[PDB]
Coordinates of C-alpha atoms and ligand atoms in Angstrom, one line a residue:
Chain A
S21 CA 1.3 -3.6 0.0
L22 CA 0.0 0.0 0.0
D23 CA 1.3 3.5 -0.9
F24 CA -1.6 5.9 -0.1
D25 CA -4.9 5.4 1.8
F26 CA -8.6 6.0 1.0
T27 CA -12.0 4.8 2.0
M28 CA -15.5 4.3 0.5
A29 CA -18.8 6.1 0.1
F30 CA -22.1 4.4 -0.6
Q31 CA -25.1 5.5 -2.7
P32 CA -28.4 3.6 -2.6
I33 CA -30.0 2.1 -5.6
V34 CA -33.8 2.2 -5.2
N35 CA -36.5 0.0 -6.6
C36 CA -39.1 2.7 -7.3
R37 CA -41.8 0.1 -7.7
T38 CA -41.5 -1.5 -4.2
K39 CA -39.8 1.6 -2.6
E40 CA -37.1 -0.8 -1.1
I41 CA -33.3 -0.5 -1.4
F42 CA -32.0 -2.7 -4.2
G43 CA -28.4 -2.1 -3.1
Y44 CA -25.6 0.4 -2.8
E45 CA -22.9 1.5 -5.2
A46 CA -19.4 1.8 -3.6
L47 CA -17.4 4.9 -4.6
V48 CA -13.8 5.6 -3.6
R49 CA -13.2 8.6 -1.3
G50 CA -10.3 10.3 0.3
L51 CA -9.9 9.9 4.1
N52 CA -11.3 13.4 4.5
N53 CA -14.2 12.7 2.0
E54 CA -12.0 13.9 -0.9
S55 CA -13.2 13.1 -4.4
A56 CA -12.9 9.7 -6.1
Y57 CA -10.9 11.2 -9.0
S58 CA -8.5 12.8 -6.5
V59 CA -8.0 9.2 -5.2
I60 CA -7.8 7.5 -8.6
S61 CA -5.6 10.2 -10.1
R62 CA -3.0 8.9 -7.7
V63 CA -3.4 5.5 -9.4
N64 CA -0.7 4.7 -12.0
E65 CA 0.3 1.5 -13.9
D66 CA 2.0 -0.2 -10.9
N67 CA -1.1 0.7 -8.8
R68 CA -3.7 -0.9 -11.1
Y69 CA -3.7 -4.3 -9.5
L70 CA -3.2 -3.4 -5.8
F71 CA -5.6 -0.4 -5.9
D72 CA -8.2 -2.6 -7.5
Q73 CA -7.9 -5.2 -4.8
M74 CA -8.0 -2.6 -2.0
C75 CA -11.1 -1.2 -3.6
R76 CA -12.9 -4.5 -3.5
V77 CA -11.8 -5.4 0.0
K78 CA -12.6 -1.9 1.5
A79 CA -16.0 -1.9 -0.1
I80 CA -16.9 -5.4 1.1
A81 CA -15.5 -4.9 4.6
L82 CA -17.2 -1.6 5.1
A83 CA -20.5 -2.9 3.6
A84 CA -20.3 -5.9 6.0
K85 CA -19.3 -3.7 9.0
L86 CA -22.3 -1.4 8.1
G87 CA -24.7 -4.4 8.0
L88 CA -25.6 -4.1 4.3
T89 CA -28.0 -7.0 3.5
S90 CA -28.9 -6.0 -0.1
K91 CA -26.6 -5.9 -3.1
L92 CA -23.1 -4.3 -3.2
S93 CA -22.1 -2.8 -6.6
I94 CA -18.4 -2.2 -7.2
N95 CA -16.8 -0.3 -10.1
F96 CA -14.5 -2.4 -12.1
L97 CA -11.3 -0.6 -12.8
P98 CA -11.3 -0.4 -16.6
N99 CA -7.6 -0.9 -17.3
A100 CA -7.2 -3.7 -14.8
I101 CA -8.1 -6.1 -17.6
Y102 CA -4.7 -7.9 -18.0
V103 CA -6.4 -11.4 -18.3
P104 CA -5.6 -12.7 -14.8
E105 CA -8.6 -15.0 -14.4
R106 CA -7.4 -16.1 -11.0
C107 CA -6.8 -12.7 -9.4
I108 CA -10.5 -12.9 -8.5
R109 CA -9.1 -15.0 -5.6
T110 CA -8.6 -11.9 -3.4
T111 CA -12.2 -11.0 -3.9
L112 CA -13.7 -14.4 -3.2
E113 CA -11.8 -14.7 0.1
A114 CA -12.7 -11.2 1.1
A115 CA -16.4 -12.1 0.6
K116 CA -15.9 -15.3 2.7
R117 CA -14.4 -13.6 5.7
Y118 CA -17.2 -11.0 5.7
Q119 CA -20.0 -13.6 5.2
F120 CA -21.1 -11.7 2.1
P121 CA -22.5 -14.0 -0.6
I122 CA -20.9 -13.5 -4.1
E123 CA -24.4 -13.3 -5.6
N124 CA -25.0 -10.1 -3.6
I125 CA -21.9 -8.5 -5.3
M126 CA -22.4 -6.7 -8.6
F127 CA -19.5 -5.5 -10.8
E128 CA -20.0 -2.5 -13.0
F129 CA -18.1 -2.4 -16.4
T130 CA -17.2 0.5 -18.6
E131 CA -15.3 0.7 -21.8
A132 CA -12.7 3.4 -21.2
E133 CA -10.7 3.2 -24.4
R134 CA -11.9 2.8 -27.9
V135 CA -10.0 -0.2 -29.1
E136 CA -13.0 -2.7 -29.8
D137 CA -11.9 -5.0 -27.1
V138 CA -15.2 -6.5 -26.4
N139 CA -13.9 -10.1 -26.3
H140 CA -11.4 -8.7 -23.7
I141 CA -14.1 -7.3 -21.5
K142 CA -16.5 -10.1 -22.6
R143 CA -14.1 -12.8 -21.3
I144 CA -14.2 -11.1 -17.9
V145 CA -17.9 -10.5 -17.8
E146 CA -18.8 -14.1 -18.6
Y147 CA -16.1 -15.4 -16.2
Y148 CA -17.4 -13.3 -13.4
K149 CA -20.8 -14.5 -14.3
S150 CA -19.7 -18.1 -14.0
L151 CA -18.5 -17.4 -10.4
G152 CA -22.0 -16.1 -9.3
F153 CA -21.3 -12.4 -9.4
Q154 CA -23.9 -10.0 -10.8
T155 CA -22.8 -7.7 -13.6
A156 CA -23.8 -4.3 -15.0
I157 CA -22.9 -2.3 -18.1
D158 CA -22.2 1.2 -16.6
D159 CA -22.5 4.6 -18.3
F160 CA -24.4 3.1 -21.2
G161 CA -24.6 5.8 -23.9
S162 CA -21.8 8.1 -22.6
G163 CA -19.9 7.8 -25.9
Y164 CA -17.7 4.9 -24.7
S165 CA -19.9 2.2 -23.3
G166 CA -22.5 1.5 -26.0
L167 CA -24.3 -0.8 -28.3
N168 CA -21.0 -2.6 -29.3
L169 CA -20.9 -4.0 -25.8
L170 CA -24.5 -5.2 -25.8
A171 CA -24.0 -6.9 -29.2
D172 CA -21.5 -9.5 -28.0
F173 CA -22.6 -10.1 -24.3
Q174 CA -25.4 -9.1 -22.0
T175 CA -25.1 -8.2 -18.3
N176 CA -27.8 -8.5 -15.6
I177 CA -28.2 -4.7 -15.6
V178 CA -27.5 -1.7 -17.8
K179 CA -26.9 1.6 -16.0
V180 CA -28.1 4.3 -18.4
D181 CA -25.6 7.3 -18.3
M182 CA -27.1 10.3 -16.6
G183 CA -26.4 12.6 -19.5
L184 CA -29.2 10.6 -21.3
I185 CA -31.6 11.1 -18.3
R186 CA -31.0 14.8 -17.5
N187 CA -34.3 16.7 -18.0
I188 CA -35.8 13.7 -19.8
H189 CA -39.3 14.9 -18.9
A190 CA -38.8 18.0 -21.3
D191 CA -36.5 16.5 -24.0
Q192 CA -38.4 14.6 -26.7
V193 CA -35.1 13.4 -28.2
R194 CA -33.9 11.9 -24.9
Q195 CA -37.5 10.6 -24.6
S196 CA -37.2 8.7 -27.9
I197 CA -33.7 7.3 -27.0
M198 CA -34.9 5.9 -23.6
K199 CA -38.2 4.4 -25.0
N200 CA -36.4 2.5 -27.7
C201 CA -33.5 1.5 -25.4
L202 CA -36.0 0.1 -22.8
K203 CA -37.6 -2.0 -25.5
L204 CA -34.2 -3.1 -26.5
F205 CA -33.3 -4.0 -22.9
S206 CA -36.6 -5.9 -22.5
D207 CA -35.9 -7.8 -25.7
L208 CA -32.5 -8.8 -24.3
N209 CA -34.1 -9.4 -20.8
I210 CA -31.7 -6.9 -19.2
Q211 CA -32.8 -4.9 -16.2
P212 CA -32.5 -1.1 -16.7
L213 CA -31.2 1.3 -14.0
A214 CA -31.6 5.1 -14.4
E215 CA -28.5 6.8 -13.0
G216 CA -28.1 10.4 -11.9
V217 CA -31.7 11.2 -11.2
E218 CA -31.9 14.7 -9.8
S219 CA -35.5 15.9 -9.8
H220 CA -39.0 14.6 -9.1
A221 CA -39.8 15.4 -12.8
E222 CA -37.1 13.0 -14.1
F223 CA -38.0 10.2 -11.7
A224 CA -41.7 10.5 -12.4
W225 CA -41.0 10.3 -16.2
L226 CA -38.6 7.4 -15.8
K227 CA -41.0 5.5 -13.6
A228 CA -43.9 5.8 -16.1
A229 CA -41.6 4.6 -18.8
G230 CA -40.9 1.4 -16.9
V231 CA -37.7 2.0 -15.1
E232 CA -37.6 0.4 -11.6
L233 CA -34.0 0.6 -10.4
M234 CA -32.9 4.3 -10.0
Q235 CA -30.0 6.1 -8.5
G236 CA -29.1 9.7 -7.9
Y237 CA -29.1 12.7 -5.7
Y238 CA -32.9 12.9 -5.8
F239 CA -32.9 9.8 -3.6
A240 CA -29.6 10.4 -1.8
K241 CA -26.1 11.7 -2.2
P242 CA -23.4 9.1 -1.5
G243 CA -22.7 8.6 2.2
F244 CA -19.1 8.7 3.5
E245 CA -18.5 5.3 5.2
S246 CA -22.3 5.2 5.7
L247 CA -25.4 3.7 4.2
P248 CA -27.7 6.7 3.4
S249 CA -31.4 6.6 3.9
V250 CA -33.8 7.5 1.0
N251 CA -35.8 10.7 0.6
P252 CA -39.4 9.8 1.6
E253 CA -40.9 12.3 -0.9
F254 CA -40.9 9.8 -3.8
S255 CA -42.1 7.0 -1.5
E256 CA -45.3 8.8 -0.5
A257 CA -47.7 5.9 -1.5
Chain B
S21 CA 2.3 23.3 -48.5
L22 CA 2.0 19.6 -47.4
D23 CA 4.8 17.0 -46.9
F24 CA 3.5 13.9 -48.6
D25 CA 0.9 13.2 -51.3
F26 CA -2.1 10.9 -51.6
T27 CA -5.3 10.5 -53.7
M28 CA -8.8 9.1 -53.2
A29 CA -10.7 5.9 -53.7
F30 CA -14.5 5.9 -53.9
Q31 CA -17.1 3.4 -52.6
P32 CA -20.7 3.5 -53.8
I33 CA -23.7 3.9 -51.4
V34 CA -26.8 2.2 -52.9
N35 CA -30.4 3.0 -52.2
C36 CA -31.9 -0.5 -52.2
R37 CA -35.5 0.9 -52.4
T38 CA -34.9 2.9 -55.5
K39 CA -32.1 0.6 -56.7
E40 CA -30.2 3.8 -57.6
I41 CA -26.8 5.1 -56.5
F42 CA -27.0 7.5 -53.6
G43 CA -23.4 8.7 -53.9
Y44 CA -19.9 7.6 -53.0
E45 CA -17.7 7.9 -49.9
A46 CA -14.2 9.3 -50.5
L47 CA -11.5 7.1 -48.9
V48 CA -7.8 8.1 -48.8
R49 CA -5.2 6.0 -50.5
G50 CA -1.5 6.3 -51.1
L51 CA -0.3 7.5 -54.5
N52 CA 0.1 3.8 -55.4
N53 CA -3.2 2.6 -53.8
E54 CA -1.7 2.1 -50.4
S55 CA -4.1 1.7 -47.5
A56 CA -5.9 4.6 -45.8
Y57 CA -4.3 3.9 -42.5
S58 CA -0.8 4.0 -44.0
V59 CA -1.6 7.5 -45.3
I60 CA -3.5 8.7 -42.2
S61 CA -0.8 7.6 -39.8
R62 CA 1.5 10.2 -41.4
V63 CA -0.7 13.0 -40.0
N64 CA 0.5 14.6 -36.8
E65 CA -0.9 17.8 -35.2
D66 CA 0.8 20.3 -37.5
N67 CA -0.6 18.2 -40.4
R68 CA -4.2 18.0 -39.2
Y69 CA -5.5 21.2 -40.8
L70 CA -3.6 21.0 -44.1
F71 CA -4.2 17.3 -44.5
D72 CA -7.9 17.8 -43.7
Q73 CA -8.0 20.5 -46.4
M74 CA -6.0 18.4 -49.0
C75 CA -8.5 15.6 -48.4
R76 CA -11.6 17.7 -49.1
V77 CA -10.2 19.3 -52.2
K78 CA -8.8 16.1 -53.7
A79 CA -12.1 14.4 -53.1
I80 CA -14.1 17.2 -54.7
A81 CA -11.7 17.7 -57.6
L82 CA -11.3 14.0 -58.4
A83 CA -15.1 13.3 -58.1
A84 CA -15.5 16.2 -60.5
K85 CA -12.9 14.7 -62.8
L86 CA -14.6 11.4 -62.7
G87 CA -18.0 13.0 -63.5
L88 CA -19.7 12.2 -60.2
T89 CA -23.4 13.2 -60.4
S90 CA -24.7 11.9 -57.0
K91 CA -23.6 12.7 -53.5
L92 CA -20.0 12.9 -52.3
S93 CA -19.4 11.8 -48.7
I94 CA -16.2 13.0 -47.0
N95 CA -14.8 11.8 -43.7
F96 CA -14.4 14.6 -41.2
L97 CA -11.1 14.0 -39.5
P98 CA -12.1 13.2 -35.9
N99 CA -9.2 15.3 -34.5
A100 CA -10.0 18.4 -36.6
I101 CA -9.3 20.6 -33.6
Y102 CA -11.3 23.7 -32.8
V103 CA -11.1 25.0 -36.4
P104 CA -13.1 28.2 -36.7
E105 CA -16.2 28.4 -38.9
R106 CA -14.2 30.2 -41.6
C107 CA -11.8 27.5 -42.6
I108 CA -14.8 26.1 -44.4
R109 CA -14.0 28.7 -47.0
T110 CA -11.6 26.4 -48.8
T111 CA -14.3 23.7 -49.0
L112 CA -16.9 26.1 -50.4
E113 CA -14.5 27.5 -52.9
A114 CA -13.4 24.1 -54.2
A115 CA -17.1 23.1 -54.5
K116 CA -17.8 26.3 -56.6
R117 CA -14.8 26.1 -58.9
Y118 CA -15.5 22.5 -59.6
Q119 CA -19.3 23.1 -60.0
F120 CA -20.1 20.7 -57.2
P121 CA -23.3 21.7 -55.4
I122 CA -22.8 22.0 -51.7
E123 CA -26.1 20.1 -51.1
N124 CA -24.5 17.1 -52.8
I125 CA -21.6 17.0 -50.2
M126 CA -22.0 15.0 -47.0
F127 CA -19.6 15.1 -44.0
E128 CA -19.2 12.0 -41.8
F129 CA -18.5 12.6 -38.1
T130 CA -17.0 10.2 -35.6
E131 CA -16.4 10.9 -31.9
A132 CA -12.9 9.4 -31.4
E133 CA -11.7 10.9 -28.0
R134 CA -12.9 13.1 -25.2
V135 CA -16.5 12.0 -24.5
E136 CA -17.9 15.3 -23.2
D137 CA -17.1 18.0 -25.7
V138 CA -20.1 16.9 -27.7
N139 CA -21.2 20.6 -27.6
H140 CA -18.3 21.3 -30.0
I141 CA -19.2 18.7 -32.6
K142 CA -22.8 20.0 -32.3
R143 CA -21.6 23.5 -33.2
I144 CA -19.7 22.2 -36.3
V145 CA -22.6 20.0 -37.4
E146 CA -25.2 22.7 -37.1
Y147 CA -22.9 25.2 -38.8
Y148 CA -22.4 22.9 -41.8
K149 CA -26.1 22.1 -41.9
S150 CA -26.8 25.8 -42.2
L151 CA -24.6 26.1 -45.2
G152 CA -26.5 23.3 -46.9
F153 CA -24.1 20.3 -46.5
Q154 CA -25.5 16.9 -45.7
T155 CA -24.3 15.4 -42.4
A156 CA -23.9 11.9 -41.1
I157 CA -22.9 10.2 -37.9
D158 CA -20.3 7.5 -38.9
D159 CA -19.5 4.3 -37.1
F160 CA -22.6 4.5 -34.9
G161 CA -22.7 1.8 -32.3
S162 CA -19.0 1.0 -32.1
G163 CA -16.6 2.3 -29.5
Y164 CA -16.7 6.1 -29.8
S165 CA -19.8 7.4 -31.7
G166 CA -23.0 6.5 -29.9
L167 CA -26.3 7.6 -28.4
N168 CA -24.7 10.6 -26.6
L169 CA -24.3 12.2 -30.1
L170 CA -27.9 11.6 -31.1
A171 CA -29.1 13.1 -27.7
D172 CA -27.7 16.6 -28.4
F173 CA -27.9 16.8 -32.2
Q174 CA -29.3 15.0 -35.2
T175 CA -27.7 14.6 -38.5
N176 CA -29.2 13.8 -41.9
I177 CA -27.9 10.2 -41.8
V178 CA -26.6 7.7 -39.2
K179 CA -24.2 5.1 -40.6
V180 CA -24.6 2.0 -38.5
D181 CA -21.2 0.5 -37.7
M182 CA -20.5 -2.7 -39.6
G183 CA -19.8 -4.7 -36.4
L184 CA -23.6 -4.4 -35.8
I185 CA -24.4 -5.5 -39.3
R186 CA -22.1 -8.5 -39.5
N187 CA -24.1 -11.8 -39.7
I188 CA -27.3 -9.9 -38.7
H189 CA -29.5 -12.4 -40.6
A190 CA -28.6 -15.0 -37.9
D191 CA -27.8 -12.9 -34.8
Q192 CA -30.9 -12.3 -32.6
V193 CA -29.0 -9.8 -30.4
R194 CA -27.9 -7.8 -33.5
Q195 CA -31.4 -8.2 -34.9
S196 CA -32.8 -6.7 -31.7
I197 CA -30.3 -3.8 -31.7
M198 CA -31.1 -2.8 -35.3
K199 CA -34.8 -3.1 -34.9
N200 CA -34.9 -0.8 -32.0
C201 CA -32.4 1.5 -33.5
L202 CA -34.3 1.8 -36.8
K203 CA -37.4 2.8 -34.8
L204 CA -35.3 5.3 -32.9
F205 CA -33.8 6.7 -36.1
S206 CA -37.3 7.0 -37.6
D207 CA -38.5 8.8 -34.5
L208 CA -35.7 11.3 -35.0
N209 CA -36.4 11.4 -38.8
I210 CA -32.8 10.3 -39.4
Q211 CA -32.1 8.3 -42.5
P212 CA -30.1 5.1 -41.6
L213 CA -27.3 3.6 -43.6
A214 CA -26.1 0.1 -43.1
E215 CA -22.3 -0.1 -43.5
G216 CA -20.1 -3.0 -44.3
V217 CA -22.7 -5.3 -45.9
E218 CA -20.8 -8.3 -47.1
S219 CA -23.3 -11.0 -48.0
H220 CA -26.7 -11.4 -49.7
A221 CA -27.9 -12.8 -46.4
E222 CA -27.1 -9.7 -44.5
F223 CA -28.4 -7.4 -47.2
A224 CA -31.7 -9.4 -47.4
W225 CA -32.3 -9.1 -43.7
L226 CA -31.5 -5.4 -43.5
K227 CA -33.7 -4.8 -46.5
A228 CA -36.6 -6.7 -45.0
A229 CA -36.0 -4.6 -41.8
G230 CA -36.6 -1.4 -43.8
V231 CA -33.0 -0.2 -44.5
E232 CA -32.7 1.5 -47.8
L233 CA -29.1 3.0 -48.0
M234 CA -26.4 0.4 -47.7
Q235 CA -22.6 0.2 -48.3
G236 CA -20.1 -2.6 -48.4
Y237 CA -18.1 -5.2 -50.4
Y238 CA -21.3 -7.0 -51.3
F239 CA -22.1 -4.1 -53.6
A240 CA -18.6 -3.0 -54.6
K241 CA -15.2 -2.5 -53.0
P242 CA -13.8 1.0 -53.3
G243 CA -12.4 2.0 -56.7
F244 CA -8.9 3.6 -56.8
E245 CA -9.4 7.0 -58.4
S246 CA -12.5 5.5 -59.9
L247 CA -16.3 5.3 -59.3
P248 CA -17.1 1.5 -59.2
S249 CA -20.3 0.1 -60.6
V250 CA -22.6 -1.9 -58.4
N251 CA -23.2 -5.7 -58.4
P252 CA -26.5 -6.3 -60.2
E253 CA -27.3 -9.1 -57.8
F254 CA -29.1 -6.8 -55.3
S255 CA -31.2 -5.1 -58.0
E256 CA -33.0 -8.4 -58.4
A257 CA -33.3 -9.5 -54.7
Ligands
C2I301 O1 -28.0 12.7 -9.1 C1 -26.6 12.8 -9.4 N1 -26.2 13.8 -10.1 C2 -24.9 14.0 -10.4 N2 -24.0 13.1 -10.1 C3 -24.4 12.0 -9.4 C4 -25.7 11.8 -9.0 N3 -25.7 10.6 -8.3 C5 -24.5 10.1 -8.3 N4 -23.7 11.0 -8.9 C6 -22.2 10.9 -9.2 O2 -22.0 9.7 -10.1 C7 -20.5 9.4 -10.0 C8 -20.4 7.8 -9.6 O3 -20.8 7.1 -10.7 P1 -19.7 6.7 -11.8 O4 -19.3 5.2 -11.5 O5 -20.4 6.6 -13.1 O6 -18.4 7.7 -11.9 C9 -17.0 7.5 -11.7 C10 -16.2 6.0 -11.6 O7 -17.1 5.1 -10.9 C11 -15.1 6.2 -11.0 N5 -15.0 5.4 -9.6 C12 -15.5 5.8 -8.5 N6 -15.3 5.0 -7.5 C13 -14.5 4.0 -8.1 C14 -13.9 2.8 -7.6 O8 -14.1 2.5 -6.2 N7 -13.2 2.0 -8.4 C15 -13.1 2.4 -9.7 N8 -13.6 3.5 -10.2 C16 -14.4 4.3 -9.4 O9 -15.1 7.7 -10.6 C17 -16.7 8.0 -10.6 C18 -16.9 9.5 -10.5 O10 -16.6 9.7 -9.1 P2 -17.7 9.8 -8.0 O11 -17.8 11.2 -7.7 O12 -17.2 9.1 -6.6 O13 -19.3 9.4 -8.2 C19 -20.1 10.2 -9.1 C20 -21.3 10.8 -8.3 O14 -21.7 10.0 -7.2
C2I302 O1 -18.2 -4.7 -46.7 C1 -17.0 -4.3 -46.1 N1 -16.3 -5.2 -45.3 C2 -15.2 -4.9 -44.7 N2 -14.7 -3.6 -44.8 C3 -15.4 -2.7 -45.5 C4 -16.5 -3.0 -46.2 N3 -16.9 -1.9 -46.8 C5 -16.0 -0.9 -46.6 N4 -15.1 -1.4 -45.8 C6 -14.0 -0.7 -45.2 O2 -14.8 0.4 -44.4 C7 -13.7 1.5 -44.1 C8 -14.2 2.9 -44.7 O3 -15.1 3.6 -43.9 P1 -14.5 4.2 -42.4 O4 -14.8 5.7 -42.5 O5 -15.4 3.7 -41.3 O6 -13.0 3.8 -42.2 C9 -11.8 4.5 -41.7 C10 -11.7 6.2 -41.4 O7 -12.9 6.9 -41.9 C11 -10.6 6.6 -41.8 N5 -10.5 7.5 -43.1 C12 -10.5 7.0 -44.4 N6 -10.4 8.0 -45.3 C13 -10.4 9.2 -44.5 C14 -10.3 10.5 -44.9 O8 -10.3 10.9 -46.2 N7 -10.2 11.4 -43.9 C15 -10.2 11.0 -42.6 N8 -10.3 9.8 -42.3 C16 -10.4 8.8 -43.2 O9 -9.7 5.4 -42.1 C17 -10.9 4.5 -42.6 C18 -10.4 3.0 -42.9 O10 -9.8 3.1 -44.2 P2 -10.4 2.3 -45.4 O11 -9.7 1.0 -45.4 O12 -10.1 2.9 -46.9 O13 -12.0 2.2 -45.4 C19 -12.6 1.1 -44.6 C20 -13.0 -0.1 -45.8 O14 -13.1 0.5 -47.1
CA303 CA1 -20.5 3.0 -11.5
CA304 CA1 -22.0 5.2 -14.1
CA305 CA1 -16.8 7.0 -43.1
CA306 CA1 -17.7 3.9 -40.7

């Protein structure tokens, strides 16, 4: 091992149908709640492996210590894809010691560099799948993560990038994109998740369109080393 | 200025509904028909502007020389910096001197790098549209160019990346992507173009799916300094 230290924040994912917590996304934070990028910008090429392992262990240990009983979603470091199909060992043992079933752990994948890897990320997604992990395509529709990923493999979940959601209630173009992507997701039996929801107007539009899993400041900011509670305003029913 | 020289190849775009030629895409070649990548890899940052200009004029002058009477589609260099809206003068002047109507010239845009200065490509696209040029999103559904582009601006055409077309007659995931993307394109009144069509089987499925404009080796490989004719096999089927 370790060169610098950091901890985790947690942001709830809500099932807007049932009003229950689907899970929490783990997000790296500095020890004084500094930004994730501030932490990751300290990550270089010799850091990729060890930082990735600390990330998984810190999130799992803190989720366990906090008593999380729903799912834990961890960001997969995108350039940690050096084909080491046994470096998942550190993860499985971390889950064992913390009595956290692998099936309650979801890994979020993003393409970060255009170099039509697919098979490279696909080998990982299907391998993680074979171990019992849940998987998600993250930032779908943010330029990098796109249809090319969905053509060669399908995850349990697709997190729609928040740029596509912003002000969707007033944006007929964004409205058409989402409707046809939801029909696509349903055709591929993939569960959608609307990310970055900021206002009642977005949430209300996303919910009528059929999105159940949602995430964003409207429900709760991330909580430093905590499991935030959810705004009761949406859950009025 | 320039340091090296090059010329153009041309590949027909067919409208399978009208069975007519839509136009040709210009594709860079070495002076002895070397590959586009071999030529383009010679471009650095002090080359970008002048090479981008040389490309446009050579395509317009040679299409004129060859007697091209349909549309001319020119690849917009993805790293064509923050060029002001007055470097378009060279383009307009070449079109005029060669009596090539501006409305018969289409520019193809790809995202490449930096995912969030999509407001910049929007300014360029809307500026070119205002002058009368046709515009297209190239490589749609591959690594870089995706839904984020369609969310903030709409071009005349979207060229669906050939990775999504390959084997589409037998690939239910790809069939699902295209089906839902065609309905999206139609909602945005965007004309789709299926790129890289290689077999009768692919062409037949895309055509039954409603695609009119297509491009690929099935119809004709690019012609060095020439305008290829198109395989009569599609004009029957
Ligand atoms: O309503 C909202 N309106 C606006 N913004 C909202 C709303 N709701 C949430 N957000 C925000 O969405 C981001 C998290 O989602 P994302 O994964 O797409 O972004 C990246 C990526 O994950 C990476 N990263 C982070 N941690 C790790 C890690 O442990 N291992 C590997 N990579 C890691 O750096 C993240 C950006 O840093 P963050 O600031 O920490 O988080 C933001 C913030 O919470
Ligand atoms: O059925 C098929 N099966 C298989 N392959 C098929 C089929 N049909 C077509 N092809 C191929 O598809 C590509 C053309 O389209 P694309 O734009 O996506 O490709 C890039 C890019 O645009 C850029 N480039 C090229 N010229 C310029 C330029 O003037 N200014 C700026 N950038 C320029 O380098 C191009 C690659 O060079 P190429 O090898 O010549 O072209 C290929 C080839 O012909
Ligand atoms: Ca994420
Ligand atoms: Ca995300
Ligand atoms: Ca092109
Ligand atoms: Ca292309």
